[PDB]
Amino acid sequence: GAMAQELKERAKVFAKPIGASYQGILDQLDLVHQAKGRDQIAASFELNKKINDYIAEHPTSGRNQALTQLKEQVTSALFIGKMQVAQAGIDAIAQTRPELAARIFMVAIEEANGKHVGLTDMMVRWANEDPYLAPKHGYKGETPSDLGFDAKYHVDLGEHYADFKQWLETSQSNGLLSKATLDESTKTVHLGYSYQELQDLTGAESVQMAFYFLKEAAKKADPISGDSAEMILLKKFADQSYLSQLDSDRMDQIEGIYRSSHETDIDAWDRRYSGTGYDELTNKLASATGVDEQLAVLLDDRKGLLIGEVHGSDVNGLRFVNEQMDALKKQGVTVIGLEHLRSDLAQPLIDRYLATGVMSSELSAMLKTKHLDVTLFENARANGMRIVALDANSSAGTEHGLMYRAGAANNIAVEVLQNLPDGEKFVAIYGKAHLQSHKGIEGFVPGITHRLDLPALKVSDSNQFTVEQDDVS
């Protein structure tokens, strides 16, 4: 009958029933109403995204222009006054990455107040050109709370589930990969390790095998793009909380790189370790014969030592520290720094060994991977010294990836080696890649040497120290 369907129709023209995607907008509004600080800003950006997503799927919906005005009101409230100066860049990122735009938005507020001018454009340029800041969906859905750890990935293995299960349980029976839980019902694995942390445990054949089937499983999920296995795991199987952690940390490092370029006194460094300062130091160091009085020159009002090693053999640093450890102890050295290990996981393992005297399996696997002598850790514990890991959690094809690592290594070196107890020196071992400063078109990052006010050193097979010159194009 013509009656009804018509009666049904204007029941809709008046009060249209709440759809599944309009409800998401109505719920997103409640977040804008209740949230404070940065969360409220991010919610507003997420609101605009859900509005823009709604209009695309539903062009003829009558809610469009009502939502369009709503988006206008929100956008105007956000970028009022001096905030419109960087509106274009931020709002462009907010179209795909609301939470990332919010972090930059907070910086833009401080820059509207005169603080750290130029940081906003730097963080925008990074978010547009650095692949690691590209839109990363990750895994969204049901996540277990039974885990005794914070899962970084939720990888669906599929056909490689059987082979992964074997090498995982083989590793867990050896005290490796403890933070990992399987689920055959979904054939997924709740992994608590990053791509970088697994790579430092590949010294054990059991882990490297499981690492293989993991990387292969990711390539099955996305063989159409040019993304590496590491990138796929982030875009497809990464935990949402972990992605927020990575984005937050990566924003902090850019801000760290920014402040390093203005506040680090390079003028004093070049006067002390370059030109005349380099000549005065080299000649005074050359006059010293034997190990002990050479260390006296190098630690003459200097917080520590920076010895460099390059790729291949080149391990005089690791050899000198192990053999002449008490010679360092005499000079006041109490800390030994290694760039060979990543701080986030290696440091609790090292501290537990230095305290109990028992080396865990996970630490033993790391030492095997990085070809580190266990005798070093034994002599360090016997001498009451502390070994610290100095590497960041970054990758080993853009320039931004190298600048991130160079800056993140600086922050680690600062929070560990810069402010030791008065009288305590240190001996850190870096590659010659970080003892130098990064001078690229896309930015500048001061080297470890600059932020720690120390020269770059090189020790020969005859235990003779020579001061390396700064690499400047």
Residue numbers in the entry: -4 to -1, 3596 to 3987, 3993 to 4069
Copy text verbatim from the article accompanying this structure deposition.
To date, more than 10 MARTX effector domains have been annotated, including several domains of unknown function in Vibrio species, among which the fifth domain of a MARTX toxin from Vibrio vulnificus CMCP6 is a Ras/Rap1-specific endopeptidase (RRSP). RRSP catalyzes sequence-specific cleavage of the Switch I region of the cellular substrates Ras and Rap1 (18, 19) that are critical for a myriad of signal transduction events, including innate immune defenses. Structural and functional bioinformatics and cell biological studies revealed that RRSP belongs to the TIKI superfamily, and it is composed of an N-terminal region mediating its localization to the plasma membrane and a C-terminal region responsible for cytotoxicity. In this study, we determined the crystal structure of an RRSP from the sepsis-causing pathogen V. vulnificus CMCP6 (VvRRSP), and we demonstrated that it is a metal-independent TIKI family endopeptidase.
Deletion of N- and C-terminal flexible regions resulted in a core construct (residues 3596–4072) that produced crystals diffracting X-rays to 2.7 Å, with four VvRRSP molecules in the asymmetric unit (see under “Experimental procedures” for detailed information on structure determination and refinement). The structure of each of the four protein chains is essentially identical, except for the N-terminal α1 helix spanning residues 3596–3609. Size-exclusion chromatography revealed that VvRRSP exists as a monomer in solution; hence, the structure of chain A was considered representative of the subunit structure and was used in further analysis. The enzyme activity of VvRRSP (residues 3596–4072) was confirmed by in vitro KRas cleavage assay, demonstrating that the construct was functional and processed Ras and Rap1. The VvRRSP structure can be divided into an N-terminal lobe (N lobe, residues 3596–3722) and a C-terminal lobe (C lobe, residues 3740–4072), and the N lobe can be further subdivided into the membrane localization N1 domain (MLD), consisting of four helices (α1–α4), as characterized previously, and the N2 domain comprising three helices (α5-α7). The C lobe can also be separated into two subdomains, the C1 domain (α8–α12 and β1–β3), and the C2 domain (α13–α22 and β4–β11) that adopts a typical α + β TIKI fold. The structure of RRSP reveals that Asp-3721 on α7 forms a salt bridge with Arg-3841 on α12 that helps to maintain the structure between N2 and C1 domains. During refinement of the RRSP structure, we noticed that the electron density map around residues Arg-3988–Gln-3992 located close to the active site in the C2 domain is disordered, indicating flexibility and a potential involvement in substrate recognition. Although we did not observe any metal bound to VvRRSP during refinement of its structure, we biochemically examined whether it belongs to the TIKI metalloprotease family. Superimposition of VvRRSP molecules in the asymmetric unit reveals different conformations for the MLD fingers, indicating flexibility.
